[PDB]
Each structure stands twice: as C-alpha cells, then as structure tokens.
C-alpha cells in the first residue's frame, strides 16, 4: 500500500533462519540425540536492525535476497510479526534461502555453528536500480558484496544531488566482517559503523585506536562509529572531537545475539530523529544494554 | 485387504550437508540445505509408496504451516493421511540433521514437541479390513501392546487367507519397548538396541533375543555395512551381504528403507532370504543418493 514520502528507514542485507538447539552434551557423529529446547529465529544483521527500528517506533523496510519456499514463508511471517515492510525483497529464481543450524552445549555453553550455504545470490546494483527511493528518509547497508553495494551507494549520491537539503536521504554503512573487499565501503555513507572484530583484525586494540586510525578512509563530513562491548562506544565526526558513551550493562547477561544490531539501529534511529551524535551514542548504548539482559528483542523499549 | 499401515512418527528434518563433521565450538559452512519429511514410519511410507505399494500413515500431527508441508509431501507421494491422529495441544516435532557428504553419516538433534502419541483409543477408530500389513514403530509400548492385542483379536475372527501380517520395530534402547518382542510376525531390532544388550554381531543378537518373540515370528537385525540377518522358527540363520554404493553420500533413513523393503517383499510372498536380500539392496541404493528419489 501507500507509504508516505521520505518516511521509512531501509535496511539492505542478510536474512537467515537460525535453528538453535540446546543440548546436554555435544553429539558425536552418526548419533540420534534429543535436545532440551529448540528455537526457530530470524537472524541477519540488516534483518535484526529492522526488528529494532519497528520496536523503536520507526516505519521500516527490509531489502535482501530470498527464494520462494517454506523458509522464506517463516521469515516473511516473522518480519510481518515485527511490523517490517517486506515489499523490497529480491526474490531469486535459483538458490536456497539462508538457514544456519546452531548447537549450544548446556554444560560449557559453547556454540557450534553450521553456516548457511553460498547458493543464494546477494542483492545487485540492478536489483537496487529498480527501487523508487522517495519513500526512504535513511538507507542503511550491511557490507556484503562491496563492488555491487558501491554502485547502489553511488545511486543514492546521484539521487541526493538533485534534492533540496531537507529531502536528502541519509546513508549508513556497516563493515562487520573482516574481509578486504568490504574496506572500500568506508568511503561511502554519512555514518560508518565498524565492528570490534574488523578493528582488531586491522590491528587496533581499542575503539579510540580504530576511530583515529580509520577516519582517513571516510568521505568528507562523515561520522565513524565503533562499539567495543563492555567499553561502551565511540564516535568521530569531521570536527576531530572523539565522542564516547559508557556501556549500560544489564543486572545479569541473558542474550548478546543481535546487540550490535540493536546498537546500530538505535544510533540510526536517534540520528534520524534529529539528535546529536553524542545523544545517539548514549541512546544506542542504553538500548543495546537493555537487550543483553533480555531473551530476544521483546521489551527492549 | 490391500493397503500397508505404518504407525509411528512424522518429523520435519531440517538437513545440512557438510563436507566434514563440525568440530565442537567450530564454525563450518554447509554445501546445501533441504527440508525432508522424516520420522521412521513416515520414511517407511515414502519407500513403500515408491515401490508401488498402497500405504497409509497413522501418527500425531499438529495443524500448522509445518504439517501443511508434511501433508503436501505425503499427498505428492500417495500416502493415505486419513488415519492421522490430529492433536490440538503442541507443535509438530522437528530435527536438525547434519549429513556428512564424505561418508554419509547422519547426526540427528531432535526436538520432541510433547505432542500426545497415538493411543489405543485413536487405533480402535481404524477399519482393519483395508489392511494387508500393519507396521508399528516402538514408541508408547504399554499403549501399542493394546493396539497389537486388538490386531490378534481381528485375526482370530478371520481365515488364514485374509489375516493381517504384523511387524514391529525396536529402534531405541528403552526397556519399556522390550515387551513388543513379543508381538508381530516380523520383529526388527536395531544394531544400537543389540549393542545395548551386550551383543557384538547381528548373529549374536538373534540367537540371544529369539526366545522373546511370538511363536512362529521372524526376528530381523540389520547391521549397517555388515549386511543383515534373520532367524525364524526353523532355527536356521539367514544372512544377506550389503549392497554398498561405491560412494556412500546419505545414510538418513537407510534403516527405514531396509524395514519397508523387507515388509514389501514379505507382503508380496517372497522368502525371508529374498526379503532380507531386497532390504539390503534398496537400503544400499538409497545410501548413494540424497533423499529417496531414484531408489527405483
Ligand atoms: O550404510 C548402510 N547402512 C544400512 C543400514 C541398514 C541396512 C542397510 C544399510 N546399508 C548400508 C550400506 F553399507 F550399504 F551403505
């Protein structure tokens, strides 16, 4: 139906069906064992950020690859359940909709993961060329297929060029996996989110070290953001003033799965609402903190 | 008396095909993913259907989007879902299956959804005149014995020409299930049940457990790559070497393929030797393929 002009936040990236099983002891190959509990969860960075923005009170839309089937059916119903607009999905004729199987040992708490197959093609620049951008006030891209995502990001810059400053689409990028191909995405977006893993792999031993060491890579006037678990988060703008927020840990830590995604979405939300980078770092840390003492995303606000 | 009835589980098998079994706390990526209609009695229905045998499934199912897929698989196959004991409380069971492509080993992490099992009450509603054979997957032993007694009673009232052949499977090493040994013309005992009783071969297990079977019953024990063995009233051991494929890619449901093919051959009046041999034959073809298409 009718989405008002420049009203939505779009998240471009991965959706996956995570089957999570809790077991007494790790299964030995060729065995038939019974789990304590089993959960079917909708995962993926851009998918999780959508759930959060819906819960935060934001009209939001997801854009990722899915193949028609029963896995896609569960995921779409979950998106819809979290009030996410699913009309921009790139429906693929060939490939398997991602599904990862996870095994949690009730004993040592260790996570054994069997990642989804590579069969499904990622969203292309041509798939993206087809999108009428006027309904989006902000577009967020989870770095995956950088070459292609660069063309998408050039398109938003092109769109923006012919628009008044009050009708310009704000853009954020996320470099979460420590893969070389992605490091070119640093040059795009008004807000750049770099992870602890990417920073550590690049050498940096802290968020100040990362932000001071990678700010050169950003486009003129961009804000480089880094969350460092318990150390809270830092942000660095074009003024050179390193901003910081201490973490807001929960009384006890329940589930940290999707905490960075909660951080990203909350920062995007705060900025989209006209708040300062400092007000936004604080908001992000408050919400990502509340989430960690919760099972899933129910009651994060 | 035409159809073959299978009593037991139906489970959604969420399959991931790996090149090597994952190490604890590791993070491997699978080659392919698939959903499959699992559960022992359900797998046996796929096989019987494929062998051209009119069959039916009776098991507990919760209406939903999972069961809708399962029923669409049964229907695509030709399995009579009419006897499904539909429940209201709970969800349909589901399992995570890691299939090692290199050797075909299958690791199953099962989620049993508390779904109430098919009871003697559900079974009394069944018209036993359409059935040629009845196979029961050892689950609620005390409850299934009542279902078995009901079949013997129908048999006493019928000529040897129109009697129902009955087969039982004891797959899990649960002491409740040993009562089933017990009933039925054919009794399938798994290698894992046999090992859990101190037996180190299919021949050992048969010589040991035969005393526990109904008078005139055939006790059958498959032993993976070591083939299968059988023992009847005559006290003569029957053996069948296996039919391994050059490259073993999927052992998920091989035992159910064996059981169903053994039932199929016997239902068609072939000797226990021929049936043993056919079971190994079909279980072998299946191990070289992913799933069940192309086993015939
Ligand atoms: O691995 C196997 N598992 C079986 C399980 C039951 C009956 C026959 C089987 N054959 C094989 C194989 F050796 F032929 F492949």
UniProtKB/Swiss-Prot annotation, chain B:
Gene Ontology biological-process annotations: fructose metabolic process; regulation of glycogen metabolic process; response to fructose; response to glucose; response to insulin; response to sucrose; response to zinc ion
Enzyme Commission identifier(s): 2.7.1.3
Consequence of changing residue 41 to T: In FRUCT; no effect on ketohexokinase function; decreases enzyme activity but no effect in substrate affinity; decreases thermal stability
Highest taxon of the lineage: Eukaryota
Activity regulation text: Requires potassium. Inhibition by ADP.
Catalytic activity: beta-D-fructose + ATP = beta-D-fructose 1-phosphate + ADP + H(+)
GO cellular component: cytoplasm; cytosol; extracellular exosome
Gene3D superfamilies, alphabetized: 3.40.1190.20
Residues that coordinate or bind ATP: 106, 224-227, 253-256
Pathway(s): Carbohydrate metabolism; fructose metabolism
Coiled-coil intervals: none
GO molecular function, one term: identical protein binding
UniProt keywords, alphabetically: ATP-binding, Carbohydrate metabolism, Disease variant, Kinase, Nucleotide-binding, Transferase
UniProt enzyme class: transferase
The protein's assembly and partners: Homodimer.
Cited function: Catalyzes the phosphorylation of the ketose sugar fructose to fructose-1-phosphate.
Disease / disorder: Fructosuria: Benign defect of intermediary metabolism.
Family assignment from sequence similarity: Belongs to the carbohydrate kinase PfkB family.
Name of the protein in its database record: Ketohexokinase
The organism of origin for this protein: Homo sapiens
Gene that encodes the chain: KHK
